[PDB]
Design a protein around this ligand. Structure first.
Ligand SMILES: CC(=O)Nc1nc2ccc(-c3cccnc3)cc2s1
Length: 843
């Protein structure tokens, strides 16, 4: 039984999709995968320290930066400790441990075991880490902030308790019987044929078509298409890709070799995906669950089992020329056969791996074997330092082989929870490229999620995000998610439960409000009024008393501050919500401010924000800080999600509107005035000016490399302390935004120089040449971003932007100049591109 199912109904409302359902399946791959993950799960559930799991200490092993050592002028750090409005300050060494620090306290007070939680967060300072390595601590230092801690007792591991569990040499050929659609598109008489590709990691190996026929709602061919590929030549994870043209309207896929290593036999009636108008949605083994409206195709398979010399000088240089080449530079036939003939020489350079493994004729049995023999002698790979860029490329859509991919996942095992979180989003998106539902990478995510509540928490939302918004992959992900929830342990099952209730109630309210204000620039009296009452109505006897904040799980949100909630003034009508801090030990009475928005796809934003963090940590490796401000954002459902409200901030546009705010007259001098009146001292002003030169610069480089640099004033923001930040990534040109008003804060005006500009240029160019040290990583991330998170993208030119941006294949000198010019374009255009948004109101 009875409470195996109530549970299962619980798991289904948390997941947001029913995995036990089998209405959309033509084999048993998902259920097998549900069976398959019990053990990896139970393994990690069995092997985890109950205590440390309950306290999820957030820790890093990275060096403390130069800029944060400069924040410690005494080899000594302050830490206020409280019990019940009684508290003392302790002078502590950066290398002191929480345990050790508890020795130095027990003396001071009194003349059994407790723990150091952070005042106002479900965060802890525990475990054998020197405090200098707890993330909360580094964050306090960076922002000029006092470390406040309360002395309470551990959380009880019982609360995590997991519920106990209860469970031939023939050429290949394929019979096209035909297609069926209840209702035809456009309606005139065009032309229709079927295309049947045998694919492997986007390599097309062989291809046959049918004779075309007129597009009638039922078309019949009854033809064998004989490929030349031999059955024995077919490689695991090969896809029979079936497509319809009249041109490309529909596609569906079928794994020729199933999760048991059996050739696929029998009749099939696949409901096909319809195009819109390259992209990860094109790869899915899933069929369209919409049986009533979708085009469908009918087929038959009936075809069983299966599971040196010294290299000369001037070719070495061609080989090396190739290996050095970036991830997006294409390989020639010539290239590919070079790599292959010298596969053993290539095997020594881990950088060569992606290129080498795409010089493999995967449609030849013998070659694969030699390739598997090649993988056997994996000494140099196993031993190399972990390179994420390189690891990630082997997980992209170019690699379908399970053992190539698995060595990449081998290298990720050595990542610490700190780095998993950096790449988690991108690793979840890369499940989309796995031929099978059960994969080394899917198990890795599972395993790293269960090991650590912070990874588990984000794993839940990231996966739920995709389940709710993609039919192409909701089945797969729903299976991985189910597997997570069965090991995460009852505390969390209750946490997630609270969270789902909240963000479903609030989405109702978000959408009901959009209804009332048609568009009409003004947000009405009646409008805000109805907001309040709905919120009053929800708080009254339904909403959870409290809940974790999805984009920062340390924070527990209390009641809604109904007075402060409102509707924002966009064409979309996002909610502005503020909640009380549910933690009574909180250092403040400062509300938690969340924004709910429907209208842009928030997955794009998540992805962009996450590259931003990556770019921040890349800057940590050269002791740089550009004070980026990647606010929280969790994509929750269909074109909808939540956003972190940054406190004490306004729009550039609005600082322009204050003094002028005309129809578009922009003034050079206002930004600097705004800061002064929002700086009490004149010291804190120059700090704002400082913060701004870094934040401006950071956002100039980042935004440019990503090609999201021509933005409007309104979608750029500044905090009252100089911290600048772009928002709204969902949504004559300019490379980036360095307007005359930014420039005026840098003591400069329409072609001259000055100290703070000399600084700005110094940082940009450094920031720039740095990111280029990580070219391959960024290229891989961006290219993955597009394929898994955008519309349809040109599998050359949309993607090929960034490599021209990072000015690939260039000496440092050139590239610095290249950037400097870009600044000079924004100096030439001044306000002109800014100006131009409006003017087109009628264009
Ligand atoms: C005080 C205040 O209004 N702060 C704000 N912070 C943010 C951060 C992000 C976004 C945002 C909104 C939509 C899409 N993307 C980001 C809006 C605000 S308002």
């Amino acid at each position: 039984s009875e409470e195996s199912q109530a549970f299962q109904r619980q798991l289904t409302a948390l997941i947001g999709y029913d995995v036990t359902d089998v209405s959309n399946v033509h084999d048993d791959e998902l259920e097998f995968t549900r069976r398959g993950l019990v053990t990896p799960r139970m393994a990690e559930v069995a092997s985890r320290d109950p205590k440390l799991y309950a306290m999820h200490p957030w820790v890093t092993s990275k060096p403390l930066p130069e800029y944060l050592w400069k924040k410690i002028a005494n080899n000594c750090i302050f830490i206020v400790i409280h019990r019940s409005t009684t508290s003392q300050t302790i002078k502590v060494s950066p290398d002191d441990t929480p345990g050790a620090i508890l020795q130095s306290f027990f003396t001071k007070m009194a003349k059994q075991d407790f723990v150091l939680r952070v005042c106002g967060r479900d965060e802890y300072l525990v475990g054998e880490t020197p405090i200098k390595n707890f993330q909360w601590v580094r964050h306090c230092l960076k922002n000029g902030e006092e470390i406040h801690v309360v002395l309470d007792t551990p959380p009880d591991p019982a609360l995590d308790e997991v519920r106990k569990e209860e469970w031939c040499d023939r050429k290949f050929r394929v019979k096209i019987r035909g297609i069926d659609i209840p209702v035809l598109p456009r309606n005139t008489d065009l032309t229709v044929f079927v295309e049947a590709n045998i694919q492997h990691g986007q390599q097309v190996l062989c291809q046959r078509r049918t004779s075309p026929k007129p597009f009638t709602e039922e078309v019949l061919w009854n033809v064998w298409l004989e490929f030349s590929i031999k059955i024995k030549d077919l490689p695991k994870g090969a896809l029979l890709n079936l497509q319809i043209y009249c041109r490309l309207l529909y596609y569906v896929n079928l794994l020729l070799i199933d999760h048991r290593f059996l050739l696929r036999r029998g009749e099939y009636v696949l409901h096909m995906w319809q195009i819109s108008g390259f992209n990860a949605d094109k790869l899915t083994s899933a069929t369209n669950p919409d049986k009533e409206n979708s085009m469908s195709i009918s087929i038959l398979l009936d075809n069983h089992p299966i599971a040196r010399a010294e290299m000369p000088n001037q070719l070495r240089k061609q080989l090396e020329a190739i290996i050095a080449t970036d991830p997006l530079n294409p390989l020639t036939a010539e290239d590919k056969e070079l790599l292959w003939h010298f596969r053993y020489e290539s095997l020594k350079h881990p950088k060569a791996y992606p290129k080498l493994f795409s010089s493999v004729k995967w449609g030849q049995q013998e070659i694969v074997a030699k390739t598997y023999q090649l993988l056997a002698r994996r000494e140099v790979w196993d031993q190399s330092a972990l390179d994420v860029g390189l690891t990630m490329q082997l997980l992209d859509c170019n690699f379908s082989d399970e053992n190539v991919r698995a060595i990449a996942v081998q290298k990720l095992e050595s990542l610490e929870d700190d780095d998993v979180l950096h790449y988690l989003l991108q690793l979840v998106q890369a499940v989309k490229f796995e031929p099978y539902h059960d994969s080394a990478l899917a198990r890795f995510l599972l395993k790293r999620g269960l090991r650590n509540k912070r990874i588990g928490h984000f794993l839940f939302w990231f996966l739920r995000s995709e389940i709710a918004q993609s039919r192409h992959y909701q089945q797969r992900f729903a299976v991985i998610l189910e597997a997570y929830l069965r090991g995460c342990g009852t505390a969390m099952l209750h946490d997630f439960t609270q969270q789902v209730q909240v963000i479903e109630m609030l989405q109702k309210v978000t959408l009901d409000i959009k209804s009332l204000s048609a568009e009409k620039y003004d947000v009405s009296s009646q409008v805000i009024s109805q907001l309040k009452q709905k919120l009053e109505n929800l708080q009254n006897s339904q909403l959870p008393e409290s809940f974790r904040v999805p984009y920062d799980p340390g924070l527990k949100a209390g009641a809604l501050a109904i007075e402060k909630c409102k509707v924002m003034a966009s064409k979309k009508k996002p909610l502005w919500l503020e909640f009380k801090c549910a933690d009574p030990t909180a250092l403040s009475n400062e509300t938690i401010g969340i924004i709910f928005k429907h209208g842009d796809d928030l997955r794009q934003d998540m992805l962009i924000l996450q590259i931003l963090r990556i770019m921040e940590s890349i800057w940590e490796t050269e002791s740089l800080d550009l004070c980026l401000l990647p606010y929280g954002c969790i994509s929750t459902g269909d074109k909808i999600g939540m956003i972190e409200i940054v406190k004490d901030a306004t729009t550039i546009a609005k600082i322009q509107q204050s003094t002028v705010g005309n129809t578009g007259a922009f003034k050079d001098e206002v930004l600097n005035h705004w800061l002064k009146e929002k700086s009490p001292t004149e010291e804190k002003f120059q700090a704002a000016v400082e913060r701004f030169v870094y934040s401006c610069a950071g956002y100039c480089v980042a935004t440019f490399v990503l090609g999201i640099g021509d933005r409007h004033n309104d979608n750029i923001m500044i905090t009252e302390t100089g911290n600048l930040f772009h928002i709204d990534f969902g949504h004559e040109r300019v490379p980036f935004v360095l307007t005359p008003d930014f420039l005026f804060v840098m003591g400069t005006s329409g072609k001259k120089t000055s100290p703070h500009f000399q600084k700005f240029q110094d940082i940009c160019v450094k920031a720039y040449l740095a990111l280029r040290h990580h070219t391959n990583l960024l290229i891989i991330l961006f290219s993955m971003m597009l394929m898994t998170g955008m519309p349809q993208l040109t599998s050359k030119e949309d993607i090929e932007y960034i490599r021209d941006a990072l000015t690939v294949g260039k000496n440092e000198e050139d590239a610095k100049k290249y950037f400097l010019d870009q600044i000079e374009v924004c100096r030439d255009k001044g306000w002109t591109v800014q100006f131009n948004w409006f003017l087109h109101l009628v264009l």
